[model samples]
Target: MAKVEQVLSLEPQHELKFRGPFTDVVTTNLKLGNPTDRNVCFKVKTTAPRRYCVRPNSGIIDAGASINVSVMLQPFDYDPNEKSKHKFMVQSMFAPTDTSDMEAVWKEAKPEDLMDSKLRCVFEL
Candidate 1:
């Protein structure tokens, strides 16, 4: 009975590394739904030519539930002043609905977009 919700916000954890004027950046949050009738696992990916994933590779998101995910960005090394012309893509995965069949379910659901995500003052080291 649960449905996917709007993206929340892009939070820059204190661990993010930045060097430069730090202008022209984009950050966002995405929410995903649990598709199965029970707990399911998920992962994330980006299209910046720079990609990373959440550690441990998997986690349980209960059925009929949604969770907020963070996406952070800074100008790429080659483009410092220009706003990153990159559009990020968030993909979610559910555990194979059938183990014996071993079917793959990628991009089965649309991700909530966080285009209006805001920026916070960069924390100093």
Candidate 2:
């Protein structure tokens, strides 16, 4: 498809950075904004799901509104030599006006109707 317009806008558009020594838990925030007049639904997914925790990972953003998601990375031994292989993906779509069943809505949605935004994970000392 040519020039597909995405409905949701993201802050820090390219990466999610975690400044840490890895000795303690590190957290990062991702912001999602819906600039249109229609409600939008969004979900966050990660490559290393078990290594991080997410809050309000999936939710609906009101028209001309925004929501924030917190990602907490569990404590681990820091390895500066090793590059992070983790990534996070944000998937979203316009919410149906008739249904509040989010799970069902996502399941029933067509793949072509969805939008995806991916962010690389950065580990900083």
Candidate 3:
């Protein structure tokens, strides 16, 4: 039986100042379950009401394993001159089960298992 034990959170390395256009920022590592799973997968979503894709979709976790995932955030047709804010959401989904509702399960995720994208800040180049 697979379940979501933890969620990824963002920690700003520095203050992000909007200068002209777009800026690049690196998000903090998301910690998942304890060492014991064979594999783990991560999904990223933006509050822009938009969708983006992640490379290598999933990763292989060995017994008592832990790994770090790097993700990039880009604004779509966004104007750097204009002050705007965006939020992101990260969810960790484990192998499906017949006795649980994925949607409900996700909605009822623990604080440790759900991350609020707003916590991350934009960085200036």
Candidate 4:
């Protein structure tokens, strides 16, 4: 059997639940946990990027620490019958101790060295 790869752990592992009145912006929080001994860098991507806003979307997480990411969905017509096809991807990798330039780090990083996890969005009005 292959050893499990070490990557950042995600709370609410399967989905991100967003509560809403559908009048204004609705927000949901996702937490990223680093259980490894090395620092991990992460980036959040969404299928409908233009419909949502994410804060601190990309950053380095200290070893044995966690961070809360807030995702805000823009207010729009509420269609309970409509199905949502939204999803998010959290890409991560072991960070270089010196995380001075994240842009450069991602730019030079190879695809095979990167680890990622994904979550689907659920809306409740």
lDDT of 3 by residue, 1-125 (tens): 43443433233322222332333323334343424343333454555433323332344343455555444444444554544365445455443333333346556656554433333435343
TM-score of model 1 vs. true structure: 0.40
Residue pairs in candidate 2 whose N, alpha carbon or C atoms collide under 3 angstroms: none
Local accuracy of candidate 1 as per-residue lDDT tens digits, 1-125: 33443232223421233345435454444455554565455544444445433332334466777666655555534443344333333333344455332133333333431112222323221
Mind giving the per-residue lDDT tens digits that candidate 2 earns over 1-125? 64356678888788999998889889999888999888888888988888998887788899999888898899999888888889888888888767667778887878888878888889999
lDDT for each of the candidates? 0.41, 0.85, 0.41, 0.83
Of the candidates numbered 3 and 4, which has the greater lDDT value? 4
Scored against the true structure, residue 45 in model 3 reaches a CA lDDT of 53
List model 4 lDDT by residue over 1-125, tens digit each.
43335487787787988777778999888888998888888998898888988886898898899999998899888788777779888888887765666778888987777877778888887
Error of 4 at 106 (Å): 0.8
**If both were scored by TM-score, which would come out higher, candidate 1 or candidate 4?**
4
Q: Which candidate number has the best TM-score?
A: 2
Q: Each model's TM-score, in the order given?
A: 0.40, 0.92, 0.39, 0.89
Error of 3 at 114 (Å): 7.8
